[PDB]
Structure formats: C-alpha cells, structure tokens
Amino acid sequence: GSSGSSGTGKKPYECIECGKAFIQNTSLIRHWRYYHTGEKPSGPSSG
Ligand SMILES: [Zn+2]
Asked: How far is ligand 1, taken at its centre, from the CA of residue 36, in Å?
C-alpha cells in the first residue's frame, strides 16, 4: 500500500527538526518546546 501528498503551499513557519508546519510564529516555537525540548526527550525517532 501507499498514500501521501505530493506538493504543498509555502508557509510562514515550518519546523525543520521533523518538518512540522504552522501559520504563526508562536505556533512554531511551541512545538519546539512542547515535544522536542519538552517531556520525553528520548523516544520518537521521526525524520
Ligand atoms: Zn519538530
């Protein structure tokens, strides 16, 4: 099987550590200090 999406409209903020996407600035910093540098630092091995 297989499924996904080829292409995507640019955005103002988009995490690079994993590739997260956002529309606002605060929305970006959050994820940065929510899961990445937040609780359980050693767990997920996403790309
Ligand atoms: Zn991230």
From this structure: 6
